[PDB]
Enzyme design. Structure first.
Site, PDB file in Angstrom:
ATOM      1  N   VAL A  77       4.092  -0.900   4.383  1.00 53.38           N
ATOM      2  CA  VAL A  77       2.747  -1.311   4.768  1.00 53.38           C
ATOM      3  C   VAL A  77       2.062  -2.058   3.635  1.00 53.38           C
ATOM      4  O   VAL A  77       1.834  -1.501   2.563  1.00 53.38           O
ATOM      5  CB  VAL A  77       1.876  -0.102   5.171  1.00 53.38           C
ATOM      6  CG1 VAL A  77       0.473  -0.556   5.538  1.00 53.38           C
ATOM      7  CG2 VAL A  77       2.518   0.662   6.320  1.00 53.38           C
ATOM      8  N   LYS A 110       2.432  -4.059   8.649  1.00 54.46           N
ATOM      9  CA  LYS A 110       3.467  -3.034   8.679  1.00 54.46           C
ATOM     10  C   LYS A 110       4.820  -3.605   9.083  1.00 54.46           C
ATOM     11  O   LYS A 110       4.970  -4.179  10.160  1.00 54.46           O
ATOM     12  CB  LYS A 110       3.066  -1.909   9.638  1.00 54.46           C
ATOM     13  CG  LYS A 110       4.031  -0.737   9.672  1.00 54.46           C
ATOM     14  CD  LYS A 110       3.554   0.333  10.643  1.00 54.46           C
ATOM     15  CE  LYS A 110       4.565   1.459  10.765  1.00 54.46           C
ATOM     16  NZ  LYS A 110       4.100   2.527  11.689  1.00 54.46           N
ATOM     17  N   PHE A 120       8.276   5.422   7.717  1.00 59.11           N
ATOM     18  CA  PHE A 120       7.522   4.584   8.641  1.00 59.11           C
ATOM     19  C   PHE A 120       7.809   3.099   8.434  1.00 59.11           C
ATOM     20  O   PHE A 120       7.554   2.280   9.318  1.00 59.11           O
ATOM     21  CB  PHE A 120       6.022   4.851   8.486  1.00 59.11           C
ATOM     22  CG  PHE A 120       5.531   4.755   7.069  1.00 59.11           C
ATOM     23  CD1 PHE A 120       5.078   3.549   6.557  1.00 59.11           C
ATOM     24  CD2 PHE A 120       5.523   5.873   6.250  1.00 59.11           C
ATOM     25  CE1 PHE A 120       4.627   3.461   5.253  1.00 59.11           C
ATOM     26  CE2 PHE A 120       5.075   5.790   4.945  1.00 59.11           C
ATOM     27  CZ  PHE A 120       4.625   4.583   4.448  1.00 59.11           C
ATOM     28  N   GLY A 121       8.338   2.755   7.263  1.00 58.25           N
ATOM     29  CA  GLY A 121       8.598   1.368   6.924  1.00 58.25           C
ATOM     30  C   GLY A 121       7.829   0.947   5.686  1.00 58.25           C
ATOM     31  O   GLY A 121       7.741   1.703   4.724  1.00 58.25           O
ATOM     32  N   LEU A 146       0.820  -1.207   0.000  1.00 58.20           N
ATOM     33  CA  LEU A 146       0.000   0.000   0.000  1.00 58.20           C
ATOM     34  C   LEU A 146       0.857   1.261   0.000  1.00 58.20           C
ATOM     35  O   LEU A 146       0.515   2.255  -0.637  1.00 58.20           O
ATOM     36  CB  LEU A 146      -0.943   0.007   1.203  1.00 58.20           C
ATOM     37  CG  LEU A 146      -1.996  -1.103   1.226  1.00 58.20           C
ATOM     38  CD1 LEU A 146      -2.932  -0.939   2.416  1.00 58.20           C
ATOM     39  CD2 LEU A 146      -2.779  -1.133  -0.083  1.00 58.20           C
ATOM     40  N   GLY A 147       1.973   1.214   0.717  1.00 65.58           N
ATOM     41  CA  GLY A 147       2.875   2.346   0.785  1.00 65.58           C
ATOM     42  C   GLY A 147       4.130   2.037   1.574  1.00 65.58           C
ATOM     43  O   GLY A 147       4.170   1.082   2.352  1.00 65.58           O
ATOM     44  N   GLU A 150      -5.778  -3.095  11.955  1.00 60.81           N
ATOM     45  CA  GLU A 150      -7.073  -2.877  11.372  1.00 60.81           C
ATOM     46  C   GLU A 150      -6.926  -2.269  10.017  1.00 60.81           C
ATOM     47  O   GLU A 150      -6.108  -1.427   9.829  1.00 60.81           O
ATOM     48  CB  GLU A 150      -7.762  -1.825  12.195  1.00 60.81           C
ATOM     49  CG  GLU A 150      -8.982  -2.219  12.967  1.00 60.81           C
ATOM     50  CD  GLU A 150      -9.838  -1.015  13.304  1.00 60.81           C
ATOM     51  OE1 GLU A 150     -11.027  -0.990  12.945  1.00 60.81           O
ATOM     52  OE2 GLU A 150      -9.319  -0.079  13.922  1.00 60.81           O
ATOM     53  N   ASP A 209       2.161  13.705  15.418  1.00 60.95           N
ATOM     54  CA  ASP A 209       2.195  13.901  13.969  1.00 60.95           C
ATOM     55  C   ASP A 209       0.782  13.881  13.385  1.00 60.95           C
ATOM     56  O   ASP A 209       0.511  13.212  12.388  1.00 60.95           O
ATOM     57  CB  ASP A 209       3.074  12.838  13.301  1.00 60.95           C
ATOM     58  CG  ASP A 209       3.446  13.196  11.866  1.00 60.95           C
ATOM     59  OD1 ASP A 209       3.443  14.398  11.521  1.00 60.95           O
ATOM     60  OD2 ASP A 209       3.745  12.270  11.082  1.00 60.95           O
TER      61      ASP A 209
HETATM   62  C1  LIG Z   1      -4.106   1.596   4.955  1.00 56.30           C
HETATM   63  C2  LIG Z   1      -4.099   1.256   6.403  1.00 56.30           C
HETATM   64  N1  LIG Z   1      -5.000   0.580   6.981  1.00 56.30           N
HETATM   65  N2  LIG Z   1      -4.699   0.458   8.301  1.00 56.30           N
HETATM   66  C3  LIG Z   1      -3.551   1.096   8.570  1.00 56.30           C
HETATM   67  C4  LIG Z   1      -2.836   1.267   9.714  1.00 56.30           C
HETATM   68  C5  LIG Z   1      -1.702   1.968   9.677  1.00 56.30           C
HETATM   69  C6  LIG Z   1      -1.235   2.520   8.499  1.00 56.30           C
HETATM   70  C7  LIG Z   1       0.010   3.293   8.534  1.00 56.30           C
HETATM   71  C8  LIG Z   1       0.996   2.920   9.400  1.00 56.30           C
HETATM   72  N3  LIG Z   1       2.089   3.578   9.470  1.00 56.30           N
HETATM   73  C9  LIG Z   1       2.285   4.624   8.738  1.00 56.30           C
HETATM   74  C10 LIG Z   1       1.366   5.094   7.850  1.00 56.30           C
HETATM   75  O1  LIG Z   1       1.657   6.176   7.134  1.00 56.30           O
HETATM   76  C11 LIG Z   1       0.637   7.030   6.693  1.00 56.30           C
HETATM   77  C12 LIG Z   1       1.248   8.247   6.031  1.00 56.30           C
HETATM   78  N4  LIG Z   1       2.063   8.907   7.025  1.00 56.30           N
HETATM   79  C13 LIG Z   1       2.109   7.851   4.829  1.00 56.30           C
HETATM   80  C14 LIG Z   1       1.288   7.249   3.729  1.00 56.30           C
HETATM   81  C15 LIG Z   1       0.730   7.871   2.710  1.00 56.30           C
HETATM   82  N5  LIG Z   1       0.052   7.002   1.947  1.00 56.30           N
HETATM   83  C16 LIG Z   1       0.155   5.764   2.460  1.00 56.30           C
HETATM   84  C17 LIG Z   1      -0.339   4.550   2.063  1.00 56.30           C
HETATM   85  C18 LIG Z   1      -0.054   3.459   2.811  1.00 56.30           C
HETATM   86  C19 LIG Z   1       0.727   3.559   3.931  1.00 56.30           C
HETATM   87  C20 LIG Z   1       1.215   4.745   4.334  1.00 56.30           C
HETATM   88  C21 LIG Z   1       0.936   5.862   3.597  1.00 56.30           C
HETATM   89  C22 LIG Z   1       0.187   4.414   7.745  1.00 56.30           C
HETATM   90  C23 LIG Z   1      -1.948   2.358   7.349  1.00 56.30           C
HETATM   91  C24 LIG Z   1      -3.119   1.637   7.380  1.00 56.30           C
END
Ligand SMILES: Cc1n[nH]c2ccc(-c3cncc(OC[C@@H](N)Cc4c[nH]c5ccccc45)c3)cc12
Length: 273
Positions: free
Chosen positions: A20, A35, A17-18, A12-13, A89, A135
């Site tokens: 995901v 994650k 943060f690592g 997903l991304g 979740e 944040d």
């Molecule tokens: C998509 C999703 N469902 N549940 C969770 C939990 C936690 C995260 C998550 C965890 N850690 C960091 C994250 O970063 C969010 C943004 N700071 C960066 C970002 C932008 N677009 C995306 C797409 C997918 C992951 C991160 C990001 C999110 C994502 C999701």
């Protein structure tokens, strides 16, 4: 055995943060997020109640993860030789606040009121659990599109809540308060309120109010979109240069603009469906 317990889907991304991944809990086909975070990239380490070295986010998520749905839930976690794996979740369908605003432009104040209220409730819940997010921004807010419910994500920059000064900050620069910019120190609640002010502006103006450090330090709020006087007042209040001039959570929610908020489901049926 995590590899057999969850069916891994598409990435997903990824970033600071690592990584995901989209996931599915094999047990009941529950939509999850997987994650991955490398141990070398981990800045803040925490301690489980049973005494175990672990990422701070795990500690923080444990303290907040209960019935309340304004915060994303940590379902499980594993330790690998060179990384930790968090199972979270995942709403579906979903979209984060950043993409939502980008796609729709500036939000109607009725919609922004609902969203902002829900965020406030989520942040209020975290602080009650002794957790500071550090944040708060659109990118860290997921929208449960079907239910109209918002959820806080990414506690990797967070910390245990305390009443003394913080001298470290790893959130986004343009969301950071002037006291961090000027003195490299801040207090938890007043700094959160500042970021909430930045967040509210972004909702109703479609963009961030400050781009450079000098703009943040000056604290002059110019509105680029049509915004009501009530909402402008609340925003400018949250963005007071002096932390002690900023409103409490209670004062924000008692604010005239904050009244007669829609229910999440009403929000979805009106603005999301
Ligand atoms: C998509 C999703 N469902 N549940 C969770 C939990 C936690 C995260 C998550 C965890 N850690 C960091 C994250 O970063 C969010 C943004 N700071 C960066 C970002 C932008 N677009 C995306 C797409 C997918 C992951 C991160 C990001 C999110 C994502 C999701």
């Amino acid at each position: 055995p995590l590899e057999s317990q969850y069916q891994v889907g598409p990435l997903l991304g990824s970033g600071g943060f690592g990584s995901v991944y989209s996931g599915i809990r094999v047990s009941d086909n529950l939509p999850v997020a997987i994650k991955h975070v490398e141990k070398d990239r981990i800045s803040d380490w925490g301690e489980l109640p049973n005494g175990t070295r672990v990422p701070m986010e795990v500690v923080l998520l444990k303290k907040v993860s209960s019935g309340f749905s304004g915060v994303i839930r940590l379902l499980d976690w594993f330790e690998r030789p060179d990384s930790f794996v968090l199972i979270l979740e995942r709403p579906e369908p979903v979209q984060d606040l950043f993409d939502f605003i980008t796609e729709r432009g500036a939000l109607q104040e009725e919609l922004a009121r609902s969203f902002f209220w829900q965020v406030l409730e989520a942040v209020r819940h975290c602080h009650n659990c002794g957790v500071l997010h550090r944040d708060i921004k659109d990118e860290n807010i997921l929208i449960d599109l079907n239910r109209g419910e918002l959820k806080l994500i990414d506690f990797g920059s967070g910390a245990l809540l305390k009443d003394t000064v913080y001298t470290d900050f790893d959130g986004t620069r343009v969301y950071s308060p002037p006291e961090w910019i000027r003195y490299h120190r801040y207090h938890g609640r007043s700094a959160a309120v500042w970021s909430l002010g930045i967040l509210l502006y972004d909702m109703v103006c479609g963009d961030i109010p400050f781009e450079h450090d000098e703009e943040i330090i000056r604290g002059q709020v110019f509105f680029r979109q049509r915004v009501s006087s009530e909402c402008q007042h609340l925003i400018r209040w949250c963005l007071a240069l002096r932390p002690s001039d900023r409103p409490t959570f209670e004062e924000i929610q008692n604010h005239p603009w904050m009244q007669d908020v829609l229910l999440p489901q009403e929000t979805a049926e009106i603005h999301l469906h």
